[PDB]
Symmetry: C4
Subunit: 349 residues, 4 copies
């Protein structure tokens, strides 16, 4: 959905005064045909008849004018009502796929002028927005809230399985018993999860002001996932990988590529043909995830620990004296690495 | 619900253009009577009057034609509108249980021709689909979404109790303190759970495109349960059982047989009359569940470990050298069995 | 809500054919006035005019007859339609609190005959059931489903806090560090929980067939709670208490008495004036809860263990030989008591 | 929303008989204009024509009178209907922002008299309440229930993250490895959580009687949070802080101040410029949270333990003899402190 159209869709989002008027018009089964332009003079030839009003906008005024036939002309910022009861006369030779004089007029006019034209069906109670060559049909709020609500429920289900997967991976990681299968399974869930969020965004956008709580739920559910998936990729790819590379991998499996177990294993740099092979490939975490999330060591300084110790297994065997010999690790950070790794080993294994 | 009818029901599932038209017709309290045939000529004798249109289908065109009396004739793939305003004249001596000329016409016509006939009640806003001798009344989406939503909530409740049961069984299993009561209680919950999924399927099917999120939730909630129930049956039945036998047992208690504690105990091969006996029967897990799910040992090679060691208790006491003597266990799989069983014992008991 | 009335309310519960007809009547804003009697002859004097039909009942027939003025007379089992378009003439000197000739007629007639009379308001879309001296207004399903859904959500919240309370009490119980405050807090949550279930029952009953999933959720959420509360009462009351006594205590705090911390402490047999005292009273569990739920020892035989050992603390210190000396404890049950108590101590403390 | 207006809003809250009448009026698309006064005589000059009724109030009577034009005059306690079909004539020179004679009349009249005037739009089905200079538009219940339901869902999400944060802080606290970052992160979640509750209150208030379950859910979800946040503030602020000071801090970050990590750190008395510094500041809990919540030591006597031992770390190293030397600690409370701290250390670390 192009950005220029998304902006127009916001004009009639729940919570706007225009939307309140359109909902009132629908509730009384008036129809409407609304032309949005900034200079009525430029459009003098497609606007005929009716009444020149040049008055300030309000939902009640729009409502009252929709009792009459014809079309209503508004300023584009929805602050002025210019015309009511007009006859719109766009070029008849412009192709239209609509049935019905009001909807056909609406499409032809939107195409001809590059402006927004809103049609409200009198007895079907549908709001159709036309802009340039686009047609957006407006969903009612209950439909949107239903979709969004179901989507969040689904995310809860995915997030639960993701946490369960990850907590099992933690154990394996602390005991150095991790296979590629374990990692790829965890990454796949994270990707699928973030995918759901992606597909639900346009519903949440269209909710406008009524989608605030939805956004907060989405945020509490998923905010820390992407950080985690990136660190998992830095911990388990075939060879050393910049955070940026890892973020790119993430972006791709969200959007362009399908998170199949083989696909992920191969993008991770492992030469696997068939999925049952993943059970057989042994891997060790580099240690970035634990270093950043638990030892609170910045990634930049984390590169050094990993450069020197190679694996988390080796980091966990290091004394505090051994750790200080890393460029950027003093007694404070050395203690943090040391103590938090042992605390996790004691408590989790 | 026969498969041939299920296909017809899909024609008017949420998300189809036909359904959008029927919903628009309902919203304006037009009625409708729609005859679906592939060759209008074959049916020249039940179709009378009206207008021959032979035009391409669309929701708006269907809407507009439903403003007129009589019936509308569509091609079966819903790509052509053949007729509007026709008088349908099926054989009057065909039995009908309907009241009202439009619904009676609809049933008689469906029976006589073997085709689909849709009746939309003008003021009751009901969509009735007739096909051959079947009558499907269409549920509105909000009703379906409500059912499906409640059903998923119920499944969450069952799934929680199932996980709690199973985690307690794990402890008992690791300490070799399992009674038949413990197993049968766990199996019963799993069966009841999978049963709910079965009963909710036709609701999710009828949702068509609007049931995508529901399907994903059902899948995240239950996908791994059946695997688990099968492995539990292989672990605790009276004598050795093929995976296929176990899958059959599962299928039955989902569908044909009621998962009573005594029923399950007896199908599991234990001679029990009254339920309080189950507390007294001591059992040991063969070890398949832990071998496949935790040691990632394929069932085929699992048969061998179990053939040699009989119980999970014995498998847990085996050294890594002892395990290698099993046909299909090398140092890698022997270590995995060994290490994962001890890790679970350390952490869970 | 008296039982005789509850039975009448079931006649128009969601899922009944009568209810389907009433919903169709409401959807078209017909009104209705329906008299339910088993012998029309007995009532010949309150039934005037209209048409004698003596025909089989169906929703469509009822619908069609509600298009006409007056009242419809049905058999009480809703299998026969006796009359349509009748003028009901109950004794005018019977007091009525209703406004409107149809509702006033309905109440007076219900009172005079002891039968059911249903009034459906033509433009308010309300279903009023009158029986003897009762008036039940029917809730629409969406309203009921909303209440029930909210109630289950609330129960989830209570149940979570109950589990958290109880798991903390388990720790204290295994370490013999339990105060009366800890117990009373746990009991209070359980009582409040079971109370919610009580208040939501009439909503679930009125849902009829559409309340099946609700019932299953209520059952999965709460089924084991009452058993547990009873065992807690047997474990912590001032002196020894029969299971029946404990069940009675439970019943009371659900229904008749308000579960205040002081109230519960005193019904439990502890002489406490002010709530902060509860922090100071040390108590020990008798051991019944752990004996029945974990050792799977029947209450009858549990009385003996407790008679001999007094507290769970003492039971946990007993050898297996010491336990066998209890009437009803052999080597099997002695091992179960012994082993499960130590397993819990190892894992939970 | 001023308190005097909130009281007026309660008059038409779900569950009131007035609200039931207004809903019936809306369902039939009658309009209404209702004037609430205690002495009709005082208002003889703005009330013209119509019928003097001086009769008792009921929803059905109000309904029936709304079938006629004009306005209805009620007593302020909604027990009397004084007038129907009257012509209200407030001073025309009073400014109004409304369109439409009924709404304009309503606002002008409310302003002129200081009384409540309710307007019900005939075809838009909106209830507008005017009182003095205020205008409250009434939300329909389904809209409110939707908001409230979404808000509780959101709170569940926040509460889950809060518990997870706090349980991790517990571990760090028991091992004396707490940074300011850990605390501030936990406080921020608690503040955001309590904030959501604050913003949702007016929705729950407007639900009136239909918001009972919502209130119970809000209460089960959040009741113990504020106590906990206060104790965290007493445990981690720069220097010693009275409970009252801490409660004040809480109140502020709920309402007046935005819970940014730097803002909280500084109000806590730590001189931090940029957020990454918080990772580097080491802190120790004073011990109040554990003393009150786990040792059940009253705050007053807690001041003394902390005065003598300074940190929880030191309290955990104290013998039972050492503890008794605190003013207000006898053998009972000394044992409780001692034993519960070690039980937590054993089980959590
Ligand atoms: N060129 C036009 N200019 C201004 N108003 C128009 C124009 N064409 C149609 N309308 C307005 O639309 C109104 C309905 O016309 P109609 O033929 O029913 O179209 P429609 O596409 O079927 O719309 P509905 O779905 O019925 O609301 C009539 C008129 O007030
Ligand atoms: N044989 C028929 N062929 C074509 N159209 C028919 C036929 N019978 C009825 N209709 C159409 O149905 C319309 C309504 O007839 P009606 O007697 O009210 O039946 P119905 O079963 O009660 O349907 P409604 O529930 O009112 O919509 C009238 C006519 O336009
Ligand atoms: N004694 C009666 N016997 C049979 N039908 C009656 C009787 N009284 C009223 N009705 C039926 O009720 C219909 C509506 O009467 P009405 O005065 O509007 O009562 P009501 O209580 O206001 O009902 P509504 O709320 O309008 O449906 C008229 C008539 O068909
Ligand atoms: N001063 C008034 N006194 C009593 N009743 C009034 C008064 N002004 C309007 N009404 C009542 O309101 C009714 C509708 O008038 P109207 O001009 O449509 O106002 P409105 O603000 O548009 O209300 P609606 O939104 O249509 O319900 C007519 C009359 O019965
Ligand atoms: Mn006209
Ligand atoms: Mn993030
Ligand atoms: Mn006709
Ligand atoms: Mn499966
Ligand atoms: Mn009449
Ligand atoms: Mn029970
Ligand atoms: Mn008039
Ligand atoms: Mn509190």
């Amino acid at each position: 959905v192009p950005q220029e159209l998304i902006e127009k869709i916001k004009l009639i989002s729940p919570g706007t005064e225009l939307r309140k008027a359109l909902d009132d018009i629908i509730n009384a089964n008036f129809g409407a045909l609304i032309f949005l332009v900034d200079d009525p003079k430029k459009y003098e030839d497609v606007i005929q008849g009716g009444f020149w009003l040049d008055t300030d906008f309000s939902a009640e005024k729009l409502y009252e004018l929709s009792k009459m036939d014809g079309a209503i002309v508004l300023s584009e910022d929805i602050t002025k009502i210019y015309y009511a009861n007009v006859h719109l006369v766009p070029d008849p030779t412009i192709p239209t796929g609509e049935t019905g004089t009001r909807h056909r007029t609406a499409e032809r006019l939107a195409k001809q002028t590059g402006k927004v034209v809103i049609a409200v069906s009198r007895r079907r109670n549908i709001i159709s927005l036309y802009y340039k060559n686009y047609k957006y049909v407006v969903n009612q709020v209950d439909f949107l809230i239903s979709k969004v609500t179901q989507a969040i429920s689904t995310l809860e289900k995915y997030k639960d399985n993701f946490n369960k997967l990850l907590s099992e991976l933690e154990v394996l990681e602390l005991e150095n018993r991790v296979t590629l299968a374990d990692v790829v399974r965890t990454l796949a869930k994270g990707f699928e999860l973030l995918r759901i969020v992606e597909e639900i965004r346009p519903y949440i956008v269209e909710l406008g002001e009524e989608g605030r709580l939805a956004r907060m739920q989405l945020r509490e559910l998923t905010e820390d996932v992407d950080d985690l998936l990136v660190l998992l990729i830095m911990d388990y790819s075939s060879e050393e990988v910049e955070e940026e590379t890892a973020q790119n991998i993430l972006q791709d499996f969200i959007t362009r590529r399908e998170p199949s177990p083989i696909s992920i294993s191969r993008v991770l740099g492992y030469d696997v043909q068939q999925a049952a092979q993943l059970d057989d490939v042994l891997v060790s975490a580099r240690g970035y995830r634990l270093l950043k999330t638990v030892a609170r060591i910045p990634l930049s300084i984390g590169y050094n620990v990993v450069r020197m110790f190679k694996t988390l297994d080796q980091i966990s065997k290091a004394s505090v004296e051994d750790l200080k010999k890393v460029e950027g690790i003093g007694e404070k950070r050395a203690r943090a690495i040391s103590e938090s790794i042992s605390s996790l080993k004691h408590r989790k294994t």
